[PDB]
Design a protein around this ligand. Structure first.
Ligand code: ADP
Ligand code: ADP
Ligand code: MG
Lengths: 48, 152, 268, 96, 296, 69
């Protein structure tokens, strides 16, 4: 994560960089505590 | 010198003033000098130098405030040159510029004669695409009115 | 119900893309998808065409590559951590030997930064760019630290190789983020140490050249306003991109000399 | 020494940065750059424009060793059989 | 209330429905034709590199797609849907692709001899070349001597005087090839200004001297057809006063300054006003103190 | 042949004169003569023009140090 997009209060709308591939804007799924992302915390990501 | 009933040595003196490079106020005095160079050249019948000197002028400038008599004489001199050269479509275009001059629009004959000669110089040109286009443009032009036995 | 439809079709795996170029045929886009690609678009999409200036961070659908929600900003962590978190504090008077150099830098940096209006009040040009070319060990970074300490404003630490990422365009993105951070945090002082690493003279190599030209262009983008003043620093100016040290660009050559006898006494 | 000259221009500088970050993470560090004559001699390019990535990682090593940043309890014992082709930037006693 | 309410709500509904409409638009693939196969086929290289033989949309017309024509390839059938203008990349003004840019003529105070010489050098060909055709117009010239005191400024003013805009270039193998390549656009844009010849391991940059549309000339300048030599003096005889005055954007003082100041340009006065500002008329002896202080 | 020349502009008295010029030199003579003629503003070149160009690009190989010869 490189920019938490200000979190827009609700609906944080995280962002991520998969490096050589691309730069995506992403949500949280099944994650219990949607704060433990720390804006650089090397988060998880799905394929499609 | 030209006034002194002698002209063969008139053109020579003035055919030495490069008012382009003399570095003067603006494009009024030097336009006048170039035009008098041209007038002397036509008077002495030096048509090659006439064209060469005329190439020194930039007609685009004549879209300015006091630029009325200067451009009028400019086109009249070019028209003497072409009339003695042999072209006719060029003479047409020059008369067309004269007609389009805002001052020339004023007064009846100052535009009636212009259009008269414009139409004859359209007619006196060879049939080319350009001549056909000029025939079409001069066709009617509204102001061509019904000049008797003329527009027909 | 149409708003609900647009919401349903605005799922949120958007791809981050640029708006590299714009055109009118209506409005169109020539967006550049971060997945390194260039996708044209007839109908710009949900973006309201807020002048959609060339250069912007837009969320774009993965497959249709249509411009969905526009993103505010993106400054990589390498530029978010690239500022004086703790403003150093050395001194001004405790830099020996160099007196004319320090005075010249103080004027040409701080004085246009503090008394901005009382430069143009006299028809004066406070040149934006100061290049500190010196023989290694004179103290260019020492004076830079002194300025960062006792100058306030926002200080940017640009560190040469820090602009040469392997990926094509990432270095230019990093430079863009640096300059945008400078402009947003104005008044700002942009100190570029070891400038001989961003681009030397020629030419991965084309990537380094492209980031160098990004530096050059966005520096040229400066006006007398936009209170950001750039201070390059460098050891070996072996004719370093003569185009770099030109009108508008870095143009105050604060040469750094070797310490004279009085300088060395002061230094000890 | 050879784990600092890779392909992928910029990777070497990234390696130097990561090494120094790990050092700062540790309480008290001793780095032992050996055979540094491989990593960085002079800085002139002429025909060495293609071998500028090593120069670039050497510049990163300098800026880490001392720049606009406290370095912390990091002490470096560089070794080199030929300190006669080394860059004066690296040799100058602000870092060695 | 009804008029404004329904006007704005019509705006909003139309915008929403057009957003739904746009939601079903698929992007194209940006690429350039290469070779123009049989008139129903074109080799197009997309951006990411791959090259395909692609169709040509019927309404698109032909003869507008020639090698290098940006096209919006269809994303799946890979058909050339509709052309595009050439993208403006950062490598244009740094590649010296600038036609405009001028300051003035009076900005150059004196320099009358060199102004007139270069004027006689470059006017007549940009204007009447038929006279020459009655034989080859001169192409280049030289600006010479000290660091061409106001060389680019001389160009900057006399080009504006001649009304032809500019084509500036710097001479600080691929680079040579492309520098000669953009000559096509250079003529398309005149006075060409290949300056900074000094500072050379390049060999394709030779004086190719091709033939272009008559008119348009160059003023190639350096130190140490193209047959001219504009020698220059680093100061001027008694035009230091003149340079100071015409640089006085911000007079006995101007004399008293030039009487001991001996530099090369108006940087002297720039420093005058700058240091006076640190310490608009009311400067006087401050300028003298500066000019005494400047080292150079 | 391509240029336009007067009747007193005989080239045959610009060849009999001994001179170690080459084809490039003669092209330069003609081009310089035409340039000078236009500068002095005539549309026909003349013997004075050819004389001046002859001396302009025959003695150009000078300004050498004389102790060498
Ligand atoms: N003029 C100087 N006055 C005081 N210290 C100096 C001076 N020049 C160098 N130094 C010392 O060396 C360092 C500053 O030099 P530095 O700016 O790092 O050189 P460079 O700019 O070539 O990298 C500091 O450790 C400082 O103590
Ligand atoms: N006649 C003049 N009038 C006003 N300014 C001048 C004049 N001559 C030179 N200058 C100043 O000197 C500078 C010289 O610029 P330029 O000729 O491009 O570099 P150089 O003179 O080193 O070749 C210009 O920026 C200009 O401001
Ligand atoms: Mg100049």
């Amino acid at each position: 994560c490189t920019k938490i997009i200000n979190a827009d209060s609700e609906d944080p709308k995280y962002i991520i960089n998969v490096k050589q591939f691309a730069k995506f804007v992403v949500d949280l799924s099944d994650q219990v505590a949607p704060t433990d992302i720390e804006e650089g915390m090397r988060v998880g990501v799905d394929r499609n | 010198k030209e006034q002194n009933g002698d002209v063969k040595e008139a053109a020579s003196i003035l055919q030495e003033l490069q008012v382009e490079t003399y570095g003067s106020m603006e494009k009024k005095e030097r336009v006048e000098f170039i035009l008098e160079q041209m007038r002397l050249c036509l008077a002495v019948k030096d048509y090659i130098r006439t064209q060469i000197i005329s190439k020194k002028i930039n007609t685009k400038f004549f879209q300015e405030e006091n630029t009325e008599k200067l451009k009028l004489k400019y086109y009249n001199l070019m028209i003497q040159l072409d009339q003695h050269e042999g072209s006719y479509l060029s003479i047409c275009k020059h008369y067309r510029a004269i007609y389009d001059t805002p001052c020339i629009q004023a007064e009846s004959e100052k535009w009636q004669q212009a259009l008269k000669s414009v139409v004859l110089y359209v007619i006196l040109a060879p049939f080319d695409n350009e001549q056909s286009d000029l025939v079409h443009r001069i066709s009617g032009d509204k102001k061509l009115e019904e000049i008797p036995k003329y527009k027909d | 119900e149409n708003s609900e439809k647009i919401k349903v079709n605005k799922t949120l795996p958007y791809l981050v893309s640029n708006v590299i170029e714009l055109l009118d045929v209506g409005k169109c886009a020539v967006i550049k998808t971060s997945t390194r690609q260039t996708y044209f678009l007839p109908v710009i999409g949900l973006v309201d065409a807020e002048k959609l200036k060339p250069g912007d961070l837009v969320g774009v659908n993965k497959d249709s590559y249509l411009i969905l929600e526009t993103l505010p900003t993106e400054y990589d962590s390498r530029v978010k951590a690239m500022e004086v978190d703790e403003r150093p504090t050395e001194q001004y008077s405790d830099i020996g030997g160099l007196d004319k150099q320090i005075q010249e830098l103080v004027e040409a940096i701080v004085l246009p930064m503090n008394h901005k209006e009382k430069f143009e009040n006299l028809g004066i040009q406070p040149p934006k760019g100061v290049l500190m070319y010196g023989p290694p060990g004179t103290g260019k970074t020492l004076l830079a630290r002194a300025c960062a300490a006792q100058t306030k404003a926002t200080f940017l630490k640009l560190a040469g190789p820090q602009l040469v990422q392997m990926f094509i365009g990432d270095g230019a993105k990093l430079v863009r983020d640096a300059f945008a951070l400078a402009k947003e945090k104005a008044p700002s002082i942009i100190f570029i140490d070891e400038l001989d690493a961003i681009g030397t003279k020629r030419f991965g190599d084309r990537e380094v050249q492209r980031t160098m030209l990004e530096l050059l262009n966005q520096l040229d983008g400066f006006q007398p306003n936009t209170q950001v003043k750039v201070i390059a620093a460098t050891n070996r100016v072996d004719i370093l991109d003569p185009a770099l040290l030109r009108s508008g660009r870095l143009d105050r050559k604060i040469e750094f000399p070797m310490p004279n006898e009085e300088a060395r006494a002061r230094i000890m | 020494g050879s784990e600092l000259v890779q392909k992928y221009v910029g990777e070497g500088a990234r390696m130097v940065r990561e090494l120094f970050e790990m050092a700062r993470t540790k309480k008290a560090c001793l780095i032992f750059f050996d055979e540094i004559d491989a990593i960085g001699g002079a800085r002139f390019d002429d025909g060495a424009g293609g071998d500028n990535e090593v120069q670039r990682t050497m510049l990163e090593l300098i800026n880490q060793l001392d720049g606009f940043d406290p370095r912390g309890n990091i002490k470096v014992l560089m070794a080199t059989n030929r300190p006669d082709t080394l860059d004066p930037a690296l040799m100058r006693p602000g870092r060695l | 209330e009804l008029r404004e309410q329904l006007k704005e709500l019509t705006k909003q509904y139309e915008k929403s429905e057009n957003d739904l409409k746009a939601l079903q638009s698929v992007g194209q693939i940006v690429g350039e034709v290469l070779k123009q196969l049989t008139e129903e086929k074109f080799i197009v290289k997309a951006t990411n590199g791959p090259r395909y033989v692609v169709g040509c949309r019927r309404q698109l017309d032909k003869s507008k797609l020639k090698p290098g024509t940006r096209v919006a390839l269809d994303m799946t059938t890979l058909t050339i849907m509709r052309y595009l203008p050439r993208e403006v990349d950062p490598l244009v003004y740094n590649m010296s692709h600038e036609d405009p840019g001028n300051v003035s003529y009076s900005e150059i105070g004196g320099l009358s001899e060199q102004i007139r010489e270069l004027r006689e050098v470059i006017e007549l060909p940009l204007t009447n070349p038929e006279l020459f055709q009655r034989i080859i117009p001169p192409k280049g010239c030289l600006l010479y001597g000290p660091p061409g005191t106001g060389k680019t400024l001389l160009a900057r003013a006399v080009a504006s005087q001649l009304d032809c805009n500019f084509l500036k270039v710097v001479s600080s193998g691929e680079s040579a090839r492309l520098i000669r390549e953009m000559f096509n656009y250079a003529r398309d844009h005149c006075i060409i200004f290949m300056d900074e010849i000094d500072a050379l391991m390049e060999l394709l940059n030779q004086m190719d001297g091709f033939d272009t549309l008559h008119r348009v000339k160059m003023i190639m300048a350096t130190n140490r057809r193209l047959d001219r030599k504009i020698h220059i003096d680093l100061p001027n005889e008694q035009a230091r006063l003149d340079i100071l005055k015409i640089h006085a954007g911000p007079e006995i003082d101007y004399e008293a300054i030039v009487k001991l100041s001996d530099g090369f340009n108006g940087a002297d006065l720039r420093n005058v006003c700058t240091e006076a500002g640190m310490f608009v008329q009311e400067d006087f002896m401050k300028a003298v103190r500066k000019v005494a202080d400047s080292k150079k | 042949s391509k240029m336009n020349l007067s009747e007193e502009v005989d080239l045959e008295d610009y060849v009999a004169r001994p001179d170690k010029i080459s084809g490039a030199d003669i092209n330069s003579i003609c081009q310089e003569s035409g340039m000078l003629a236009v500068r002095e503003n005539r549309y026909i070149v003349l013997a004075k023009d050819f004389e001046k160009a002859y001396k302009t690009v025959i003695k150009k190989d000078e300004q050498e140090h004389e102790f060498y010869k």
